Amino acid sequence: ANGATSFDRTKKTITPMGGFVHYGEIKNDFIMVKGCIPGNRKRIVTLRKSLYTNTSRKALEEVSLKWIDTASKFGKGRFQTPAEKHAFMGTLKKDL
Amino acid sequence: MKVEIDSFSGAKIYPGRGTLFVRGDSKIFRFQNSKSASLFKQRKNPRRIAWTVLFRKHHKKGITEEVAKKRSRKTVKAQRPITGASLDLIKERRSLKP
Amino acid sequence: SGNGAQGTKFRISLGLPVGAIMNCADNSGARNLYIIAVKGSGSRLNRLPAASLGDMVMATVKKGKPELRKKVMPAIVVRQAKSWRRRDGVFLYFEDNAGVIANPKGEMKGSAITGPVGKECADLWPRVASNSGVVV
Amino acid sequence: AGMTTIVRDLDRPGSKFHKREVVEAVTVVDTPPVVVVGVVGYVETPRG
Amino acid sequence: MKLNISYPVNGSQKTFEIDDEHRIRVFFDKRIGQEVDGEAVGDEFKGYVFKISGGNDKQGFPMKQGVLLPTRIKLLLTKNVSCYRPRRDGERKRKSVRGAIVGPDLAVLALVIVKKGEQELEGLTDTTVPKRLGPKRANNIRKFFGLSKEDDVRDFVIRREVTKGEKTYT
RNA sequence: GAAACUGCGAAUGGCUCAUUAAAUCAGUUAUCGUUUAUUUGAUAGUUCCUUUACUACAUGGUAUAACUGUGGUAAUUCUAGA
RNA sequence: GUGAACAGCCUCUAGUUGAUAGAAUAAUGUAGAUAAGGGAAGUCGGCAAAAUAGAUCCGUAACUUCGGGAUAAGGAUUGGC
RNA sequence: GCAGUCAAGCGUUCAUAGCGACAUUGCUUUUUGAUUCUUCGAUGUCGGCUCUUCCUAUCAUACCGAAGCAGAAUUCGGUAA
RNA sequence: GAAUGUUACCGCAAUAGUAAUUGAACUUAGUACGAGAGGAACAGUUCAUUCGGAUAAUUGGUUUUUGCGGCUGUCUGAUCAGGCAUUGCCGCGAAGCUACCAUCCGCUGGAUUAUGGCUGAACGCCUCUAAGUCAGAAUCCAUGCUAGAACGCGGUGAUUUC
RNA sequence: UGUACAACGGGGUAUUGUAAGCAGUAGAGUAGCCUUGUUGUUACGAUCUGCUGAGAUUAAGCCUUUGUUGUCUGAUUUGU
Ligand SMILES: [Mg+2]
Ligand SMILES: [Mg+2]
Ligand SMILES: [Mg+2]
Ligand SMILES: [Mg+2]
Ligand SMILES: [Mg+2]
Ligand SMILES: [Mg+2]
Ligand SMILES: [Mg+2]
Ligand SMILES: [Mg+2]
Ligand SMILES: [Mg+2]
Ligand SMILES: [Mg+2]
Ligand SMILES: [Mg+2]
Ligand SMILES: [Mg+2]
Ligand SMILES: [Mg+2]
Ligand SMILES: [Mg+2]
Ligand SMILES: [Mg+2]
Ligand SMILES: [Mg+2]
Ligand SMILES: [Mg+2]
Ligand SMILES: [Mg+2]
Ligand SMILES: [Mg+2]
Ligand SMILES: [Mg+2]
Ligand SMILES: [Mg+2]
Ligand SMILES: [Mg+2]
Ligand SMILES: [Mg+2]
Ligand SMILES: [Mg+2]
Ligand SMILES: [Mg+2]
Ligand SMILES: [Mg+2]
Ligand SMILES: [Mg+2]
Ligand SMILES: [Mg+2]
Ligand SMILES: [Mg+2]
Ligand SMILES: [Mg+2]
Ligand SMILES: [Mg+2]
Ligand SMILES: [Mg+2]
Ligand SMILES: [Mg+2]
Ligand SMILES: [Mg+2]
Ligand SMILES: [Mg+2]
Ligand SMILES: [Mg+2]
Ligand SMILES: [Mg+2]
Ligand SMILES: [Mg+2]
């Protein structure tokens, strides 16, 4: 329930279905940061404390997520979970 | 945070996904992706497009156990009998005979 | 934007450069509006001024009651057709480019607005909130 | 690792989106614990 | 949103107010008529099964069984139909209606009890309100008391007491 | 005797003269070419069922308003659940 | 064969498979394409590019030396069985 | 082309807030002339497109001093490219 | 990229470059001032322009994924499945690249100019100035950011035997 | 010589939109044999339907893998 939320609560991790594209899973502690970061997927990055105390009010805002999109990135993502998928889908020629 | 559905394909649209078309009459059409959105622009009719919810509903596809039975009901038999008339004598005058 | 607009407009994709002609959506006799300028726009050499939903322009009436032609009037862009994006994350587009002639204070010359209207426009101009039918 | 969308309410008294939800883009950095293998001290000089 | 609950055994009814999304959210995506297990909505309601009978969203428009949809739509309505009372013979009016599918936009949800809980509810299982009128037509009297066609109704008709000051009547 | 149901009426009246030139309208015809509430006159012994172990005729069925109560909406001759 | 066709496109007979080669797929190019919203605002100038197109049927202005203008313009249609 | 000095006048009154005659001293080399030193065994003309950089005699933006600056607006000036 | 023992890792920072820009609304406030007409600003807030560096969750573009499907002509007897038509044509199209057509981010200290002042003589008075000194700008120096001197430098690891 | 690497295979993710084969009382229809029909029969017929959100493709810069198979000392050079 790592990519779950107080408002979502469904046990799921941040890893999108089929995984992150060109990376992997993320089985360790992770940093969710607003927006985009220099560097590309798989690159070593260094996160660093601010050099000043920002009174911005843009910072100082204390966020709480409602929801974290876990749908597949590789292709046009429909479903969050294989559970949720199997729900809407119905039953297919393989299955149980 | 609503999850809408595709006015063409019948697919869940989770937030910030696909496009939203506002037609001339003010009818709003929501698409999950550029597939519906283009099939829509092409004047395709979802009931003829085999992978559509709408198509599947009309063709009776995979629904099964939603047409299977269930159990929802009650058993009650309670006695009110009437307002302004003494409800004491409403079960004394009701013992029936037959 | 500018004069008489109450509030501030968050940025929207610009779909209407100068010389675009947009449907005139009011009852004031103008058939359409040809955009010669976009109020509050910037300066960068060779960049065409371009307007979005709820923008104040300066237009001429290319088709319509001859009393409305051969002159400049302010106008306000109520419909886009170039998909923009809101902060609630939805990319949405109307089916036509449409505006309604107004005055410098932002008061419509016409009594009604035929067709829907962008909310970003209604929030910004009150007298559009008046004449508007279904909004967004 | 990648990026993904988020939905959260907005707290900005004065904004047109105050208390309405916004969707926002975020990235995720795979960040297992580092291990401390050593210490290095530095002294000041007129050359730095 | 406000819950409006009925006990169609005692004739009891009373409302309630729930503000928590996780409590409410049990009702979302559920239609009118779908049953609800009560521990989800509260601890008092554990063991109670609720039937979703209708309700009104904000701005007040009623729901309508059968529309599906979780939104408002405008329909043509004729005689003998919900959310409309015809003013004139063969008159139909095009009126707004809220869908049958529950949503966070609902200001009131209408509820009906199916199975009793493990605990009594204040104004529902505790209090019982009697039916206003009793049988009037002949054979319906015979089916409230089971008399056959011999027993002669006239003494079995209900009699309601009332007082005129110091004169009590029947 | 309120309310409400049920019935009947709201297609008469009143106003206006925009459209309309073989249309209307007028006088004169036709319905052996039709529909017609109401009014008025008449008009109905037959209804079941392999037809002795009979079918309520001393009279068969519920489901609704008003009402009672719980409600929704800024708002209407709005109406919901019970 | 398709089609009005000695057109384009595919094929039989015959004749070729000759034109330095290998590995990559940076910039910039030469030739071939596409692009949301706007639509000549570009520019000396719509240069370039795009748009149009076959047939059947409907329809067709000024003006004219009466021969034209005219495929004027504008439309509908077209597979398979 | 730009900038001074004298201060007769202008500015209701008031030479210099803002201006300024008759005179007069200068600066500038995107004006035009004058010259003919270089290039006639050749240094590719006008304009635009594109792009960089520099000047300041500052149009805007920063902070100021004047005003015939009540406010609002404007004008003159300074440090400023 | 040779050479300053070899090779490796972690660093310093001389010098050089450097970056942010402008506007509007809310509020202040129908306020200060004014007879009136008119009519500000400082702090606070929400956005925006122009510029810059990134980035691709999402939306859009691109299509030889020649991935799936459709179509014309013809050729393989038909069938299946395919070839050719300088990538035959069409619809969708993953990935990648990519767009103020998309999203995210753009630091704060010091010293000064003009100018206004303090103290204060020269000149018993007077003066921001002569000595000394306060406040001060989109300026300047640093902070920050990009290089890292291939002839500037530090710390550290391991350093070959037939 | 192992939480090794690779080539396949499996699973997920995704793309298209229902494969071939067979079956049918679907099919505007149409032929043929007589025993001329109280569905007479045998077939042929664009298309439709069912098996079938099937089939095909899916890292070439997607994710993953207990299975399968294979690989694991060739070359040069350097010293205060
Ligand atoms: Mg796409
Ligand atoms: Mg230009
Ligand atoms: Mg009348
Ligand atoms: Mg009934
Ligand atoms: Mg050659
Ligand atoms: Mg060649
Ligand atoms: Mg190229
Ligand atoms: Mg294309
Ligand atoms: Mg274009
Ligand atoms: Mg034009
Ligand atoms: Mg021009
Ligand atoms: Mg030009
Ligand atoms: Mg010319
Ligand atoms: Mg010209
Ligand atoms: Mg020319
Ligand atoms: Mg040309
Ligand atoms: Mg095209
Ligand atoms: Mg046809
Ligand atoms: Mg004076
Ligand atoms: Mg004077
Ligand atoms: Mg004088
Ligand atoms: Mg010469
Ligand atoms: Mg020479
Ligand atoms: Mg030369
Ligand atoms: Mg030269
Ligand atoms: Mg004065
Ligand atoms: Mg040596
Ligand atoms: Mg005010
Ligand atoms: Mg005054
Ligand atoms: Mg894309
Ligand atoms: Mg193909
Ligand atoms: Mg050829
Ligand atoms: Mg940018
Ligand atoms: Mg700092
Ligand atoms: Mg000094
Ligand atoms: Mg070095
Ligand atoms: Mg070193
Ligand atoms: Mg199928």
* DSSP per-residue string spanning D1-48: -EEEEEEEE---TTSTTTTSEEEEEEEEEE-PPP-----------TT-
Residues 4-43 of A with CB under 7 A from strand I: 21-22, 34-41
Cβ contact B26:C133 at 8 Å = yes
The tokens for A66 are 């409602």
Nearest to C127 by CA among C74, C67, C58: C74
Residue with tokens 């999304």: E21
Separation of alpha carbons A42 and A45, rounded Å:
9
Nearest to A78 by CA among D8, C93, C89, B4: B4
**B86 near E CB under 8 A:** yes
**Which nucleotides of chain H have an atom under 7 angstroms from any protein CB?**
50
| Chain G bases near protein Cβ (<7 Å) | 36-41
Q: Is A80 exposed, middle or buried (0-12, 13-18, 19+ CB in 10 A)?
A: buried
Asked if A7's CB is within 8 angstroms of B32's CB, the reply is no
Element (H, E) at C92: strand C91-93
Q: Determine contact: A60 vs chain D, CB below 8 A.
A: no
Integer-rounded Cα Rg, in Å, for chain C is: 14
Residues comprising chain B, all counted:
98
How many angstroms away from the CA of E150 is the closest CA of chain B? 10
Least Cα separation, residue B16 to chain D (angstroms): 7
- Largest interatomic CA distance in chain B: 76
User: In this structure, how many other beta carbons lie within 10 angstroms of the beta carbon of residue C95?
Assistant: 15
Minimum CA–CA partner of E12 in chain B: B80
The angle at the Cα of C99, spanning C57 to C55, to the nearest 5 degrees, equals: 40
Ligand 36 centroid to A21 CA: how many Å? 39
Q: Tell me, yes or no, if A32 comes closer than 8 A to chain D by beta carbon.
A: yes
Give which of C15, C53, C54, C60 is closest to C37, Cα–Cα.
C60
**Cβ–Cβ < 8 Å for B6, B39:** no
State which residue of chain B sits closest to D23, comparing Cα positions. Answer: B16
The helix/strand/coil state of B9 is: coil
DSSP-H helix ranges across chain C: 119-124, 126-131
C1' of J69 to CA of E71 (Å) = 60
CA A75, A77, A83, A85 dihedral sign is negative
Helices (H), E39-165: 138-145
**Cα distance between residue E107 and residue B21, in whole Å:** 29
**Cα(E71)–Cα(E99) distance, integer angstroms:** 5
The answer to whether the CB of E41 falls within 8 A of the CB of E117 is no
Q: How many whole angstroms separate alpha carbon C102 and alpha carbon C110?
A: 8
What is the structure's resolution, reported in angstroms to one decimal?
A: 3.1
CA separation for the pair D33, D48 (Å, rounded): 32
How close A59 comes to chain D (CA, Å)?
11
Please list every residue in chain C whose beta carbon sits closer than 8 Å to the beta carbon of residue D20: 87-88
Report how far ligand 32's centroid is from the alpha carbon of A91 (Å): 51
Protein residues with beta carbon less than 7 Å from any atom of strand J: A 17-25, 40, 71-72, 74-79, 82, 85, 88-94; B 33, 35, 49-51, 53, 56, 59, 61-62
